[PDB]
Amino acid sequence: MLTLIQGKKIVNHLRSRLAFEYNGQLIKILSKNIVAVGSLRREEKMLNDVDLLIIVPEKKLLKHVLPNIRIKGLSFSVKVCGERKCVLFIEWEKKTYQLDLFTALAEEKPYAIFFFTGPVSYLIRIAAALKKKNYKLNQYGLFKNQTLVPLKITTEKELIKELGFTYRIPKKRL
DNA sequence: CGTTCTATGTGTACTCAC
DNA sequence: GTGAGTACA
DNA sequence: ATAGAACG
Ligand SMILES: Nc1nc2c(ncn2[C@H]2C[C@H](O)[C@@H](COP(=O)(O)OP(=O)(O)OP(=O)(O)O)O2)c(=O)[nH]1
Ligand SMILES: [Mn+2]
Ligand SMILES: [Mn+2]
Prior knowledge:
Blueprint (H helix, E strand, L loop, with lengths): L1 E2 H12 L2 E5 L2 E5 L4 E4 L8 E2 L2 E7 L5 H4 L3 E3 L4 E6 L3 E7 L4 E10 L3 H9 L2 H12 L4 E2 L4 E3 L2 E2 L7 H8 L11
Helix pairs in contact: 3-5
The structure holds 2'-deoxyguanosine-5'-triphosphate and manganese (II) ion (2 copies).
The structure holds three DNA strands.
Subcellular location: Virion
Main location: virion
InterPro entries: DNA_pol-X_BS, DNA_Pol_thumb_sf, DNA_pol_X, NT_sf, PolB_thumb, Polymerase_NTP_transf_dom
């Protein structure tokens, strides 16, 4: 059980204090690559976890980022962890809260921000409407017949447009 | 023929068996 | 190592 | 979004 007001605050603590351990060397993830997503990006009044998105700049780093995740000074358990999804139950001023971390390559930034803000039913109703047209939309790309179709694309709003859906700010998405 | 309702996707990390 | 089958998005 | 079905 978690409300937006400190959900905002928890993410503020972390914007500066996420890092991983790359073959002995700690490396800090900088906020120009931390994105809030999920119900927090959609400004839901009440949350039941925080979903952060971590953008790694080169592929060779994916294997090491999340399995070796380190947040400065706060205890947490990993329930699950791989190289593109990890889940952490963290201690917030004597409160236990669920933290889901994901990772996207730069090449995936909009596709991944889209997919990971949601809401769920939004996603089910766009991945459907695009399959009809012999496409498939997932976390990583827009694919027609197992080949990525190139889109001169950078942010979310251009992707939502260039595939043919009305763009609504996170809060008003469904 | 219009109004209303309904349904619809996809991938990751995990776990036991052969 | 593969991989069906599951928890959980 | 969109299309198929029940409804009138
Ligand atoms: N819940 C859910 N999320 C999914 C699913 N598939 C993809 N997603 C994406 C969209 C969600 O924004 C994101 C996971 O978000 P969460 O499951 O934590 O819920 P959300 O953040 O949207 O609201 P919440 O965390 O429940 O307060 O993953 C799915 O099948 N179920
Ligand atoms: Mn969430
Ligand atoms: Mn989550």
